[PDB]
Design a protein around this ligand. Sequence first.
Ligand SMILES: [Mg+2]
Length: 774
Amino acid sequence: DVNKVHLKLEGVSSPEDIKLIQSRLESVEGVNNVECDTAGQTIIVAYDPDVTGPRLLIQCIQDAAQPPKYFNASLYSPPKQREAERHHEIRNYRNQFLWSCLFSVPVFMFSMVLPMISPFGDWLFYKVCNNMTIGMLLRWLLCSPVQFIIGWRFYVGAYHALKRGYSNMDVLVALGTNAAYFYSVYIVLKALTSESFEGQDFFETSAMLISFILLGKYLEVVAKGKTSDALSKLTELAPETACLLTLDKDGNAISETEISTQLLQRNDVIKIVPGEKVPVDGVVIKGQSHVNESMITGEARPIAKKPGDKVIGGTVNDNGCIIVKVTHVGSETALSQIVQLVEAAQLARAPVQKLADRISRFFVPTVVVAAFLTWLGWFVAGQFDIYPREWIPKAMDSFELALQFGISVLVVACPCALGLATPTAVMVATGKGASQGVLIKGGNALEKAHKVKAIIFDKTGTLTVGKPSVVQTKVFSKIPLLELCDLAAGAEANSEHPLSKAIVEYTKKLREQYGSHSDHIMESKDFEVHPGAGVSANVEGKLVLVGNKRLMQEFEVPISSEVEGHMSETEELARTCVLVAIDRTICGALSVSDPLKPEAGRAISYLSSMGISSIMVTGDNWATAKSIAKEVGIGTVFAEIDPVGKAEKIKDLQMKGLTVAMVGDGINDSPALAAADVGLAIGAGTDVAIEAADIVLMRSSLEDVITAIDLSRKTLSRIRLNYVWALGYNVLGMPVAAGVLFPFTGIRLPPWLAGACMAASSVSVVCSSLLLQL
Ligand SMILES: [Mg+2]
């Protein structure tokens, strides 16, 4: 913005308006450079960042607004265009595969079914000049579009492997169509020239290979996962407008209008009405209010801000309008750092080299050498005349038979199920995971999650807490349990702290635990709110004392044994983990804190059983992090870690190998969630964490992590087996294609049971969805 702006005119289609805008901009001094892109109806304005402001430029643009349109100038790009791009890709691949089927299925049918079928089987035998048949010509004409027109991708892939020294899936593995087609053309031409030549064409294999490879590409695009990602959520987290605050106070006149935050500059002021999301980072001039800092800290404790403190863009205040002088804006904001980390992580994942490409790299030389060896062997055997002469078919020589047995190896040795292996395991894995409640967006997660050795958990909503709540209550004030809850609710009647509200819901839970919520309470008078001490309030004229020993002494309440037993670590000194909550008399207290685990302990134990270690990287107090690490069992723990520090930890672990996986809950985790090998998000968390991860967990459960890892392990199994079965019949029929059978048996090669092993291979590439991981 302040550095360079792409002012795209809206509703402008004539160069005269652009020229008027150019003249108006040149009439204003301060812009370093004006790039005049006449073609495109857009203009680039570059100038020194952190001076003046785009508001003057926008006003100058708006001064030229004339009918029939309104001349708006701001950077227009099509947002969430990757969804439409994914639809375009899906339509393109589906229609191309459908066209390949429309040309291949007739070839296969006319080749294999009609010859055996009832009277319409001699229609594709009616001879032409010499021994050219109607069937051969029709198969040629139908298959020719498939080999060439739809094969442009394959030929350009082969030409892209010109001298680079590699054999991808678009090399002879898929170009065996090129050999089969040319051999079939040779057969047809010779039948046109020869007089008996009882032979058959191989047009089936080319069309079938093209169809299966296009199906593999289509299914790969389908199983690639949900449409990339969406960094737009990070920007949506920032406010779109801000209240300009040149209002009354000394050198500030009246302003209250809402101006775009992107248009705000340094040395500006925003007040943020209570209950508003702060636009940009700043330093407060005056004002006391609590903010829900979660972009950096990640927790939900209301941080109190007094005059002279700072503020982080994205949070919401609740205790009044807090005027703030604007600090660093734009690319220097903390949210900007988070965003930049996100796209740096996104444009750093090199796509995994498909095992199909590796095989084809180490399979084409094998096939070519094998075919050449068969050709040489039969050529030698014919030139030295070992095998009987009558073995050769009519009108053929030894060299022709050698060529036949050589090209047979090339035709049979065609993967034709290699591209169908990974897609038709990833799809089934994703479906079964969605059934189990583990939605896995992207197959890349499927292949990279099996080798995960380290996992990194987060604390403020990932492993421990859904929302703060009370645990481990004991009788206090030497009063009945129901009337304990009576005191609790009576004290809560005037306090509205988030911990106090959690006490309200937990008291309601106790009430319904005693059969049902018994009636209601009396109002608490004298809501003094003693600083430091806590809530002191006359409940029906009786003073409840939710607060520490100072509040005990201000009402002259004694001290007892447990008073020094239940805080610090979590349950060591000050009688309640995060609060005090004694009420009027002393007999005990409660244990308001964050929840511990619904299952997390056994999940971590099972993860350690499989060898995957766990590391905790939180952004909370050291004491709580140590407490949780001791409780659940995580050894390594890091506290007060910003998202940048999380990314650095991921980078260090990755540099030590041991492909990592982060389980995230909120804004704090997103940089590491994108920077890890695979991202895990808790469904109960916020939208940005759901978006930034690769394996979102539908139901909030740590056991979903082990389900995902187990699913990835079982899909890395049943995929090497899929590759084995895809190599399978082809590599086992390579000897049959070569000819080692004709010396022993009488059959040379069944024309139908030569290409009709790819169907068996395709059926053998089938996966069952029975996980049962417990
Ligand atoms: Mg958290």
